[PDB]
Amino acid sequence: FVNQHLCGSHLVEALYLVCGERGFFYTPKA
Amino acid sequence: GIVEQCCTSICSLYQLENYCN
Ligand SMILES: [Zn+2]
Secondary structure (H helix, E strand, O other): OOOEOOOOHHHHHHHHHHHHHHOEOOOOOO | OHHHHHHHOOEOHHHHHHHEO
């Protein structure tokens, strides 16, 4: 794999690919 | 944390895996 630069919705797409059926938590800073 | 890091800098899929359930 290569390192990536991921902003906004594009990070949630990556997480979705990586975690799949396992699900994930999207927790931005406030 | 990871959200900012991936966007301000770079991040790897292996680091993303720390967010899976
Ligand atoms: Zn875009």
